[PDB]
Design a protein around this ligand. Structure first.
Ligand SMILES: O=C(O)CCCN1C[C@@H](C(=O)O)Oc2c(NC(=O)c3ccc(OCCCCc4cc(F)ccc4Cl)cc3)cccc21
Ligand SMILES: CC(C)CCC[C@@H](C)[C@H]1CC[C@H]2[C@@H]3CC=C4C[C@@H](O)CC[C@]4(C)[C@H]3CC[C@]12C
Ligand SMILES: CCCCCCCC/C=C\CCCCCCCC(=O)OC[C@H](O)CO
Ligand SMILES: CCCCCCCC/C=C\CCCCCCCC(=O)OC[C@H](O)CO
Ligand SMILES: CCCCCCCC/C=C\CCCCCCCC(=O)OC[C@H](O)CO
Ligand SMILES: CCCCCCCC/C=C\CCCCCCCC(=O)OC[C@H](O)CO
Ligand SMILES: CCCCCCCC/C=C\CCCCCCCC(=O)OC[C@H](O)CO
Ligand SMILES: CCCCCCCC/C=C\CCCCCCCC(=O)OC[C@H](O)CO
Ligand SMILES: CCCCCCCC/C=C\CCCCCCCC(=O)OC[C@H](O)CO
Ligand SMILES: CCCCCCCC/C=C\CCCCCCCC(=O)OC[C@H](O)CO
Ligand SMILES: CCCCCCCC/C=C\CCCCCCCC(=O)O
Ligand SMILES: CCCCCCCC/C=C\CCCCCCCC(=O)O
Ligand SMILES: CCCCCCCC/C=C\CCCCCCCC(=O)O
Ligand SMILES: CCCCCCCC/C=C\CCCCCCCC(=O)O
Ligand SMILES: CCCCCCCC/C=C\CCCCCCCC(=O)O
Ligand SMILES: CCCCCCCC/C=C\CCCCCCCC(=O)O
Ligand SMILES: CCCCCCCC/C=C\CCCCCCCC(=O)O
Ligand SMILES: CCCCCCCC/C=C\CCCCCCCC(=O)O
Ligand SMILES: CCCCCCCC/C=C\CCCCCCCC(=O)O
Ligand SMILES: CCCCCCCC/C=C\CCCCCCCC(=O)O
Length: 365
């Protein structure tokens, strides 16, 4: 090991791996504890988040061993099977995470489309199981093949595996990184488009309501006229129960008129119900937009630099050449990719589904 990158590695990896370990145990242990708290309602997004956190915490449990490897001067003492498992756990976590994130963004988009619409929980579990099976079967090759002599080396690129990984990169790069990032980019576009259009419509709706209510507030002959115009507009607008409730408000006001204080007072009750109708949409859009922005940032930080540098490192690799500068850049972006496993609970906190509700419930206990 003549190259200087090895001296860099033996100090750098123990630091970042142990930081990720402790931070990731705290975050994921607490997140999983919160998830499993009983709450009157549950959702498929809770399924996807729980699967992500379990995957991340499993991966995090391997990091003290990798740190040990480097702290011993790059000598593996944990046996051949354990080395195999290091490799396998790294890559299974990474791509299961990428797919759980992609599915989560898609789900939030599809939800913001339908704010008023167990059945989908079992489907969420079925989908998770599909993802696990496909990635675990695609990764078993790592389990097939501690190599070194006079010392025991694990975690190292070497001649024996170079051609193999050159082929596998090709697939994982395309199907495991770039295709999901493409899916995310379309999801961002669609989220922004739908959000802008819906909120423009909602502002128009609220504005016309306040116009009609200001007319009723100012000026009984014209009160009935305004209420009948509003009733006709509402009838043409036909959420059957919601429309019926608003129309019953209108009919109660129009009766209290046709029977000036009671009807004008009843006119205000539409305002709070309309504000609640607006807020339902606004909450769905907040959630979808937060999810997609945090997820794109994770991809730009954790996954795309790593896959880029990894690919070039493999393509230019030669037996008797160090390439210490490219190799150092790769080591750093590998740390970032690993660190995703402690970054993800940010998403549970800022875009969870009754996450804070479950947390406040836990705090009561
Ligand atoms: O420390 C250091 O000096 C630096 C790192 C050395 N080092 C250590 C070495 C090591 O791991 O020991 O790895 C590299 C790789 N590895 C790959 O380029 C790879 C490519 C593909 C791959 O596939 C796993 C299974 C993916 C299954 C899958 C999931 C999907 F979602 C979609 C499609 C598929 Cl197919 C694994 C590694 C590339 C460059 C260097 C190293
Ligand atoms: C992942 C990164 C690269 C995404 C950046 C892509 C840019 C080009 C995206 C982000 C938001 C997108 C816009 C979102 C909304 C609309 C309104 C629609 O009526 C025409 C397209 C238009 C104007 C989109 C054009 C493309 C767009 C500007
Ligand atoms: C918000 C999150 C900010 C994350 C910033 C830094 C992560 C901490 C990692 C810093 C570890 C650096 C180790 C190092 O640099 O070691 C090189 C040395 O020269 C080898 O001998
Ligand atoms: C790792 C240990 C964590 C234990 C794994 C948690 C079990 C998951 C579970 O039991 O499911 C809960 C609920 O059904 C969700 O829909
Ligand atoms: C859980 C905590 C594990 C934290 C410790 C994981 C790192 C163990 C370090 C180690 O034991 O390796 C030192 C080696 O003996 C030097 O030659
Ligand atoms: C969790 C990662 C799995 C870690 C594997 C547990 C290590 C087992 C072990 O220490 O075995 C040492 C011996 O050299 C082998 O026969
Ligand atoms: C429902 C729209 C799915 C379009 C995905 C096309 C590309 C598939 C590749 C990765 C995304 C996998 C997401 C599967 C989530 C289904 C809900
Ligand atoms: C909504 C905005 C539009 C969404 C789109 C934004 C995200 C693009 C995603 C993937 C493209 C990846 C393209 C990478 C192509 C590289 C091909 C290449 O460089 O090949 C090198 C060499 O020729 C081979 O051996
Ligand atoms: C780090 C960056 C986090 C950026 C998170 C951005 C969250 C913005 C979401 C939002 O404010 O909602 C917008 C929508 O118009 C309301 O309905
Ligand atoms: C909570 C946060 C936990 C994030 C922990 C690690 C992220 C890895 C970040 C890698 C830090 C890159 C900086 C670096 O590696 O510096 C090299 C040094 O200059 C040698 O020359
Ligand atoms: C590596 C070591 C990590 C192991 C410790 C991490 C904690 C893991 C799971 C904690 C969550 C358990 C919660 C069970 C349900 C409790 C409840 O329903 O109130
Ligand atoms: C992530 C580090 C390496 C992990 C290797 C694979 C471990 C799998 C662990 C947990 C997956 C949980 C499986 C639950 C999904 C099945 C649901 C169903 O079939 O209905
Ligand atoms: C904790 C379990 C780790 C086992 C210690 C290594 C034993 C050995 O030297 O073979
Ligand atoms: C999804 C986007 C589709 C990507 C299509 C082509 C990009 C793949 C080409 C880059 C892989 C070459 C790396 C290598 O030479 O091993
Ligand atoms: C990988 C190659 C990509 C091929 C697919 C390209 C574009 C598909 C875009 C589909 C957008 C349709 C969804 C819009 C909607 O849900 O209303
Ligand atoms: C790039 C392709 C993305 C195309 C998205 C267009 C779908 C929006 C049109 C619509 O649903 O009304
Ligand atoms: C990673 C993100 C890439 C940045 C893409 C830049 C394009 C952003 C375009 C529009 C952002 C719109 C923000 C939402 C405005 C809401 C205001 C309103 O609805 O009244
Ligand atoms: C967003 C970065 C993801 C990974 C980087 C880790 C460090 C980030 C630390 C703090 C970021 C906080 C982002 C909060 C977004 C929520 C905004 C909102 O609630 O509307
Ligand atoms: C981790 C700390 C990240 C910064 C938190 C900012 C709060 C965002 C908010 O206003 O809701
Ligand atoms: C809940 C996070 C609040 C942050 C406070 C900082 C210190 C907290 C650290 C560890 C507390 C561990 C909480 C686990 C105990 C179970 C919770 C309960 O009592 O219901």
């Amino acid at each position: 090991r003549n190259c200087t990158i090895e001296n860099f590695k033996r100090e750098f990896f123990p630091i970042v791996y142990l930081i990720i370990f402790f931070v990731g145990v705290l975050g994921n242990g607490l997140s999983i504890y919160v998830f499993l708290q009983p709450y009157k309602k549950s959702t498929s997004v809770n399924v996807f988040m729980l699967n992500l956190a379990i995957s991340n915490l499993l991966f995090i449990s391997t990091l003290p061993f990798r740190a040990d490897y480097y702290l011993r001067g790059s000598n593996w003492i944990f046996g051949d099977l354990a080395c195999r498992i290091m490799s396998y756990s790294l890559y299974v976590n990474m791509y299961s995470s990428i797919y759980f994130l992609t599915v989560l963004s898609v789900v939030r988009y599809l939800a913001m489309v339908h704010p008023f619409r167990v059945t989908s929980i079992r489907s969420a579990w079925i989908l998770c199981g599909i993802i696990w099976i496909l990635i675990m079967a695609s990764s078993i090759m790592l389990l097939d093949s501690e190599q070194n002599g006079s010392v025991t080396s694990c975690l190292e690129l070497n001649l024996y595996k170079i051609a193999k990984l050159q082929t596998m990169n090709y697939i994982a790069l395309v199907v495991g990184c770039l295709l999901p990032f493409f899916t995310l980019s379309i999801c961002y576009l669609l989220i922004i488009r739908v959000l802008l259009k819906v909120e423009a419509d909602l502002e128009d709706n609220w504005e016309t309501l306040n116009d009609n209510l200001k007319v009723i507030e100012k000026a009984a002959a014209q009160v009935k006229d305004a209420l009948t115009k509003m009733r006709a507009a509402a009838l043409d607008a036909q959420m059957k129960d919601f429309r019926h409730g608003f129309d019953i408000l209108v009919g109660q006001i129009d009766d209290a008129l046709k029977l000036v204080k009671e009807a004008q007072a009843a006119a205000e009750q539409l305002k709070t119900t309309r504000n609640a109708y607006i807020q339902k949409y606004l909450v769905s859009h907040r959630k979808a937009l937060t999810t997609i922005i945090i997820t794109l940032i994770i991809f730009f930080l954790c996954f795309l630099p790593y896959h880029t540098l990894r690919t070039v490192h493999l393509t230019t690799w030669k037996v008797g050449l160090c390439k210490d500068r490219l190799h150092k850049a790769l080591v750093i972006t590998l740390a970032l990719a690993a660190a995703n496993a402690c970054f993800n609970p940010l998403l549970y906190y800022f875009a969870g589904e009754n996450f804070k509700d479950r947390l406040k419930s836990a705090l009561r206990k």
